[PDB]
Symmetry: C4
Subunit: 196 residues, 4 copies
Amino acid sequence: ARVVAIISVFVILLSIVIFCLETLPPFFLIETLCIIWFTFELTVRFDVMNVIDIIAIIPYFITSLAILRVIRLVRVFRIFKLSRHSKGLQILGRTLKASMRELGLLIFFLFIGVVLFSSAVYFAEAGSENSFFKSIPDAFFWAVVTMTTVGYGDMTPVGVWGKIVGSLCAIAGVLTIALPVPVIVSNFNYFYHRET
Amino acid sequence: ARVVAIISVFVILLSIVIFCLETLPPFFLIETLCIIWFTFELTVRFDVMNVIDIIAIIPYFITSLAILRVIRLVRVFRIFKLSRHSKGLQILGRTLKASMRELGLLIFFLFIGVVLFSSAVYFAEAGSENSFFKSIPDAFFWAVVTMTTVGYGDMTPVGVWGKIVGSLCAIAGVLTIALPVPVIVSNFNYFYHRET
Amino acid sequence: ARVVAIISVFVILLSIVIFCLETLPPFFLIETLCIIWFTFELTVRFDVMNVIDIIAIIPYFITSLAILRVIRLVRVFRIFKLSRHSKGLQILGRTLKASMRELGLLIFFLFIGVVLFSSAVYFAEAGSENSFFKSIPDAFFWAVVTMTTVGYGDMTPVGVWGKIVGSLCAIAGVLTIALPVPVIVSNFNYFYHRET
Amino acid sequence: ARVVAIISVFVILLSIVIFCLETLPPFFLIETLCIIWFTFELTVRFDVMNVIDIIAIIPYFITSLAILRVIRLVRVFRIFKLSRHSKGLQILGRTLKASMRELGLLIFFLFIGVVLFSSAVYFAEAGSENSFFKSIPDAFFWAVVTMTTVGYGDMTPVGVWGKIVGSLCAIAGVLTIALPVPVIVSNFNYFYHRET
Ligand SMILES: [K+]
Ligand SMILES: [K+]
């Protein structure tokens, strides 16, 4: 039995690897052995894990560009089959389930901040011929990268008033992201300690 | 009554949406129904929330480019009418009110650091023909993005002494921003726990 | 007496302001009134604060490009005269004095990491004609910005092995900077609580 | 004896310095005195420290480009001989040994996130002629810098769907890196307190 679990993990990892390398600038035969093994255990077994196992097989049987792209993307959920053997991924899923309200609050704060600062910078830079934001929707990406401190890149065209708005945006984003993270971190620490 | 609150939230969200999309590269009719509903509840109702409700209607009645731009910008405070229904935004406002001194201290530390490091980098790079900072005021944005770890972008023209100053600036900014944030975070956690 | 303290703070702020604006692409007369007031209180008064007061007057009396640049730079210590009236700056100075060993440890860890990763990336990218680091000393700035998460900017010329080294550098820098900061933060919180 | 330890630290630092400066765009004679002193103490002494001492001498005696590059790189472990005299480096090594599982969990979470978001952005941007990611492997560096908040640089070619994926990537990376760091930080604080 322990040898089979090693075999199953090896097959899952091989499927993940071949899934990545088939996109590089045979594969189907190896994938076929993976899909037979995937469905072979499914019938013997026959929860979220079972649903993921179903999704891991649907794109194979099915095979309008949007539909094909969607099914090709949904094929990536092979990597989530590792949750059966891995423990950290199970812990991460449990914490994500148990911290839904804080995630919603974080998204709401980010949304309020992004619309506020996008309007502010758009109006502050609307009085110049060369505008770095065509519209309020065009500035959501800039605001979300600045508030996350990932960094937009170049702020050269931005004028003096725009620079003041951007400095305020940086400080406010630092604060508003430092706000709702510790609760999620504490939940993860709780679950990890309980598991270990 | 519960249906009306759903209607009110729907109207607020519709106003926010149409406010963003009217800036994209009819709308007035929908906005008119919003402004009638906004003033209709105001008279029936007749605090910070009431003041915000007044500001949400002033730009409509009023309608020198600076004055027009200012009123168009102050029109964005429709989004703060969500504080009546939302709870997280109320919590954020309460924490911002209750942590004024720490915000002032953070701004003071940032101001001292920005002027100090701006003078340092300006003087260190004043001995070269190609200067990356024309004046001490010209370096406030660079210092504030470096100390926030958002990132300025390109430091190539910066010379060896300028690079040493910038490394010191990065380390010092990391420290001086990690200093005053935990108190604000703890205040927010306190208010959020009390509300829930 | 309270009016004089307001006057003294006003004079210090005016000196700081005029010091910044004289560098923009009269001033001496206003500065002369500042320097007379600075020396007038010094004689009446006659610690670190007293030493700073001495340094605030030395460049005036003194007035080989390096010496002139050094004295012009050391003139900026007018801003530290605010420590007499401000309390947060005193707290920051006390914490900096009381956390010397941790600052030294942080600098040592940064030094070990920067030399290690600079050698690693230099050797990994030495097998290509187009090298993004001429020498091990040339990579200290890249390593210090990557480990601080400020960001170097463009990593395009960096090859596959260089990219692996850079990913390791990012992760290791995140860890090694998250390591020694909480002690300094706790010291600052202690001093701020004691003062308030 | 205390003078010899000063001499030994001076020799180690001199070796580290000359090792860096020999790469700049005599040295062997000084290095020879270092290698004689390194082997002289080794015989008198004759653990991880002893192994490091052996590695510090192997490249000298040995002296196919890959082998030469590998030995030249492995010569850099002179800097780890400072662990005998320094205490912070010993503490860092002890914490790294005592926090292996959390490092593995962090690498696993980063791996899952990087493959997931690389597939997501690659599929979202596969419907345009100008693609910012040739393949799923080509996006690991972008995902790892975005999730670490170091910053990739320019996101201009990235389209609307790609921008939504990138915003999700930034938020998720912030969370998933804030998750497993506090345990390592607490371990380091424990070891540092015990040592002091
Ligand atoms: K950054
Ligand atoms: K950052």
